[PDB]
Design an enzyme around this catalytic site. Structure first.
Site, PDB file in Angstrom:
ATOM      1  N   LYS A   1       0.455   3.705  -2.782  1.00 40.51           N
ATOM      2  CA  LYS A   1      -0.628   4.672  -2.896  1.00 40.51           C
ATOM      3  C   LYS A   1      -0.108   6.103  -2.865  1.00 40.51           C
ATOM      4  O   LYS A   1      -0.784   6.994  -3.371  1.00 40.51           O
ATOM      5  CB  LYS A   1      -1.670   4.428  -1.779  1.00 40.51           C
ATOM      6  CG  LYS A   1      -2.481   3.160  -1.945  1.00 40.51           C
ATOM      7  CD  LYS A   1      -3.407   2.957  -0.750  1.00 40.51           C
ATOM      8  CE  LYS A   1      -4.379   1.823  -0.923  1.00 40.51           C
ATOM      9  NZ  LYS A   1      -3.636   0.562  -1.049  1.00 40.51           N
TER      10      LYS A   1
ATOM     11  N   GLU B   1      -4.909  -3.120  -7.224  1.00 45.36           N
ATOM     12  CA  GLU B   1      -5.316  -3.786  -6.000  1.00 45.36           C
ATOM     13  C   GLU B   1      -6.339  -4.877  -6.328  1.00 45.36           C
ATOM     14  O   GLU B   1      -7.209  -4.678  -7.174  1.00 45.36           O
ATOM     15  CB  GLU B   1      -5.926  -2.761  -5.041  1.00 45.36           C
ATOM     16  CG  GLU B   1      -4.933  -1.809  -4.370  1.00 45.36           C
ATOM     17  CD  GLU B   1      -4.055  -2.500  -3.337  1.00 45.36           C
ATOM     18  OE1 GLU B   1      -3.091  -1.847  -2.868  1.00 45.36           O
ATOM     19  OE2 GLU B   1      -4.346  -3.674  -3.024  1.00 45.36           O
TER      20      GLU B   1
ATOM     21  N   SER C   1       0.987  -3.332   3.819  1.00 47.52           N
ATOM     22  CA  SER C   1       0.987  -4.691   4.315  1.00 47.52           C
ATOM     23  C   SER C   1       0.620  -5.630   3.174  1.00 47.52           C
ATOM     24  O   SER C   1      -0.110  -5.253   2.249  1.00 47.52           O
ATOM     25  CB  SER C   1       0.021  -4.880   5.492  1.00 47.52           C
ATOM     26  OG  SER C   1      -1.310  -4.705   5.062  1.00 47.52           O
TER      27      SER C   1
ATOM     28  N   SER D   1       0.804  -1.214   0.000  1.00 48.91           N
ATOM     29  CA  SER D   1       0.000   0.000   0.000  1.00 48.91           C
ATOM     30  C   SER D   1       0.842   1.272   0.000  1.00 48.91           C
ATOM     31  O   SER D   1       0.281   2.351  -0.184  1.00 48.91           O
ATOM     32  CB  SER D   1      -0.956  -0.042   1.225  1.00 48.91           C
ATOM     33  OG  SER D   1      -1.974   0.952   1.259  1.00 48.91           O
TER      34      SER D   1
HETATM   35  K   LIG Z   1      -4.710  -1.557   2.216  1.00 49.89           K
END
Ligand SMILES: [K+]
EC number: 3.5.2.6
Length: 263
Positions: free
Chosen positions: A48, A141, A212, A45
């Site tokens: 992002k 994702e 994670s 992540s």
């Molecule tokens: K996430």
């Protein structure tokens, strides 16, 4: 060369049973301290940040872009959608999507940012455009989090990510209004209390993004303002041998503490 901070990071790593990567940038004297700093790690992540920053960059020319409503359909929902699942069959703005991705790790929100950039290649393209030749985003994702050992997909190195986070949050890779928004977003992250922030003096102000994934991959990247002195940038990446390994946010807290104690 091998500093005593590296000696304690290596012991922390040995104790952990996993693979630790760290990169710190002290802006005051532009010094750098790194552990496995040129090895690749799955970003999970933490990618992002690049996607949100890339959309902010588009917003410099498209001034209302962050206000644009974006539909959330049932089919957009993936594996972890804490904010988006509240708006399906309604809309969210690109600002709201960016906040949801960065502050709540919302994977649906990330996918909307990727789509706004034209696919994972549009995120990588922004990285190359701000000088990062290491970052690569290959998937959306949730599959970008498979964190398979040896897989170069969706990886960067601690050195590259710390250099990039510096440019985005403290440098001028972004416009001043966009940089300020990114900082505001990072400071309001809700997912980082057990990671870098837990290893750092309470009085330091932090913005961070966690990550994670599989193989117990536990990550955090942070911009640090430690009151008085100049800001710091710290990335801590950790991954483990067993695909089903548990999260180890404590390792990141511990790396951060070692880094803070060695200043
Ligand atoms: K996430």
């Amino acid at each position: 060369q091998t500093s005593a901070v590296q000696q304690k990071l290596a012991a922390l790593e040995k104790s952990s049973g996993g693979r630790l990567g760290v990169a710190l940038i002290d802006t005051a004297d532009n010094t750098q301290v790194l552990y496995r700093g040129d090895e690749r790690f799955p970003m999970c992540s933490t990618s992002k940040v690049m996607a949100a920053a890339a959309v902010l960059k588009q917003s410099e020319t498209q001034k209302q872009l962050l206000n644009q409503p974006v539909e959330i359909k049932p089919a957009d929902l993936v594996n972890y959608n804490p904010i988006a699942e509240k708006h399906v069959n309604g809309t969210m703005t690109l600002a709201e999507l960016s906040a949801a991705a960065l502050q709540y790790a919302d994977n649906t929100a990330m996918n909307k940012l990727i789509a706004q950039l034209g696919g994972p290649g549009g995120v990588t393209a922004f990285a190359r455009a701000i000088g990062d030749e290491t970052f690569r985003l290959d998937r959306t994702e949730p599959t970008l989090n498979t964190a398979i050992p040896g897989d170069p997909r969706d990886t960067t190195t601690p050195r590259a990510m710390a250099q990039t986070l510096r440019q985005l949050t403290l440098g001028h890779a972004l416009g001043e209004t966009q940089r300020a928004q990114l900082v505001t977003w990072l400071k309001g992250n809700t997912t980082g209390a057990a990671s870098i922030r837990a290893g750092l003096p309470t009085s330091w102000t932090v913005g961070d993004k966690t990550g994670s994934g599989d193989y117990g991959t536990t990550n955090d990247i942070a911009v640090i303002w430690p009151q008085g002195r100049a800001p710091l940038v710290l990335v801590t990446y950790f991954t483990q041998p067993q695909q089903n390994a548990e999260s180890r946010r404590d390792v990141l807290a511990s790396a951060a503490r070692i880094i803070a104690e060695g200043l």
